[model samples]
Target: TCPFYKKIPGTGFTVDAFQYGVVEGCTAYFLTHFHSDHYAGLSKHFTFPVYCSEITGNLLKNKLHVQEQYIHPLPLDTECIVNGVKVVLLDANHCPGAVMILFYLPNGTVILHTGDFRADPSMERSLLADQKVHMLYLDTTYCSPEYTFPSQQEVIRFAINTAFEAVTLNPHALVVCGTYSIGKEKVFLAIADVLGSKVGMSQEKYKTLQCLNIPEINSLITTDMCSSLVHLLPMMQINFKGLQSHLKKCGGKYNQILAFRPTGWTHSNKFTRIADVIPQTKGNISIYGIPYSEHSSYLEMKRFVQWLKPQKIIPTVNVGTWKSRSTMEKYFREWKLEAGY
Candidate 1:
């Protein structure tokens, strides 16, 4: 029987649920991030008080548009007593609003839940150091030691290099990259900072950026920063095929026109058929593939687990299943003495 539920045939809760029922008892629910998995079962049946950081609350309310009466906002690192349990929120650097939570039970048991965090040196050095924990529920999305990802700085460097190369190769060309409005705004800022020109963002992105208080990036202005940029009137605005026609119209008018869209800008076939549709503008419009991701990889996950050294590691996200559980268990069994869990 799971310790989470009280009874033998207990209706214990899993991360996600396909069915709904009236569950007994008042249990505290803490949201680590705005990800769908951790929140899937929340709105429909459960109406308990949910605790999270202010940033997490803002992201959920403004971005996700989820309004519930029981949502309680807390500041980062502030401990609060809820239903006789001491809870605290810590900074999780995986995404903008991501958080790590610590639960202190009355029996001297402390549980730390790392919700999808990356090994950010700043966050680790400042927040997580000199902390003692007993049980740790970690984000093991990528728990394999061999897996690695390029650092955020490296990713930014790659994007800048690719964008610079594209501009240098074709003097009269526009470059467009795809990124999410709220989370990946940093990428756009990186592009703007390096290229000395602001990247164009969608209207929704502009609004989200304003809400987040992100400063205007690059000389390439969006509608929010300078209304003048929007008025500059693209010599030609083409979605899929009309690029050639629009380019003809703006032939000498605009130095180089660029369109930036997220990775899912067009269908897969459109990407392949680009060679057939508009081959001339292909060089003019360079597609930069930057390896930017929101989730932690196997090695990051392992390091987090090792750091926390929880008695029983529970994965909140579905990305890791039995295979991941077994791997982590093996590591724990083999290195428990060294891990000091």
Candidate 2:
């Protein structure tokens, strides 16, 4: 795998390759999501026609300050011809504006680029079900035997129940959730809805959500920090030391801090059940690492490869070393063989 090469081998396209100055063979630019890692070098000065989901385009214009003329928003599951290549964007289920790009080259080759997705069983019913994929560019963020976690709903439910129980003991407990600029909106929103509390976040985060244009989120956010006990902050701000400073800043309006750090790395096979993963506590501050992820597990990736039966598998992540890439391909070969492809 040419990790540094932005071009997609033979195709005149590049997926999430903004960091590398204009690629030689790239004719069309495709952004799978609005994450910084994916669109790292994107800025107002960049002037290449960019294709992304509608929500992602809105964020690029508002957050990244990219001009509207270069921003191209494509609707989900709809086929559009771009530079003679039949292209389709499918919901990635990873984040608000994330999508899986499906390209049909003129030579009758079908390529599916899974740009950071939480693979769902429902994807089998999409338009891709009918086509045979030749090349499968997968999101291998958790493509390892070590990462076997519960489903999104299961983790979400656990978080809600845990937070509800915590606040029950201390009614004035401050609920803090570590989140990204766009992902994990469901967890905090559900928690706020269940607890009947307003969601407090920085003005910048609130503006990012507004780019998504979700109407229900409008009433859940509060500008006044003291008005809401549930506050959403960056993932980096959930550590014990960070929470201590945050608690001190609040001036004791809340009695204690109940922090939920959501990510896939929290769970392990050593634990028989999801509930076995315990929380760490220091004084009145409790930190829970919920096994919540927006990426597909190892089994999910295998299942997707089995069903798709793609001729080739190219991993997008964990390709830094030869062993890591081969390890991922081993599973791919096994699944492809099992699928009778």
Candidate 3:
């Protein structure tokens, strides 16, 4: 939802993404993660030094063939000095390659950018254990009380249970679940492992899981579903073209197709009929939405900020215009954040 960057208080170093701030003379260009919105646009035309996670670096090289002469890959949790600033990468707990940037300034100010992450209750918070966060750039994707969804673990349990139940009741139905490019990988893999089967994926998805070096995920991707009955994959609208085109082939093998979309936006304006049992689909391929998300809710955000105790909170979610600033001010009240100005 935001770039969440700044020029250090007493230094020339800059953290910029999507070209949001004073970009000229950046002391160092630090990338938080590898989502396309943040990672793209600058890869082809960057003269400044680039820094990202080791896995994200691999993505730039192997997939996009991005030039690597200046792309520096930083390992997580290790202290490194670049442009005269001590920097460390903390696990963002959202996706495989996501990380939070902690800048220990020469002026003794500690800055944090939780790029995009789920609030991990078990997270050590050791990165900022004793240090007071001078400023925190938070991700407020679901920063509303209406979005009090379950945890990822609980949602995964529900998805796994729902999928299995759908399969059990239908008996001959092949379940298809929707996922974005990166976030819900754990859910798919866990469901597959629990069901004692492998997941089907496109070649690109296979390579990404391979590059992430997650053994459990790499072990689960299959071309055909001989062992795994259900297929969990991205629903790019193109996913259905191939699968739906060959529906007769699948229909003969399996009775029906059921689809699940896991996201928080489904409950935007009205009440939803979210149920434990998988709901029915209208068309040959049925679809349902799950309230699974990566970013923190209003409650979680309040707790995170309260715990970190930052003196100033700069919301990174589109604070460009006066209207957005007004929204940010209101968010401070609604998010239970009281004047960290």
Best by TM-score: 2
Clashes per prediction? 9, 0, 0
TM-score of each: 0.69, 0.95, 0.85
Cα shift from native, residue 213, model 1 (Å): 4.4
For 151-221, candidate 3 gives per-residue lDDT tens digits of: 67767777778768767788777767666566677767766766667887667776776778676554678
lDDT of 1 by residue, 1-341 (tens): 21241111111212222123343542545667655645555543445566676766666566556575666788777778766666777887766667876666676767666766775546556545656777666565555554445556766665666556656766555454444334655666666656566555456655455444344433445754232211112323434344444445544544554543322122332233222322224634423333455556555555555665566655554423577667766765665676765
Q: List the global CA lDDT of all models.
A: 0.53, 0.85, 0.69
Best candidate according to lDDT: 2
**Where is the poorest 10-residue window by lDDT in model 1?**
5-14
Off by over 4 Å in 1: 1-23, 41-48, 64-69, 121-127, 168-171, 213-221, 224-285, 318-321, 334-341
lDDT of 3 at 340: 49
Model 3 clash number: 0
Query: Which ranking of candidates, highest TM-score first?
Result: 2, 3, 1
The residue pairs in collision within model 1 are 142-297, 142-298, 143-298, 144-298, 178-261, 178-262, 198-218, 198-219, 198-220
User: Which candidate, 1 or 3, has the higher TM-score?
Assistant: 3
Candidate 1's error at 89, in angstroms?
0.8
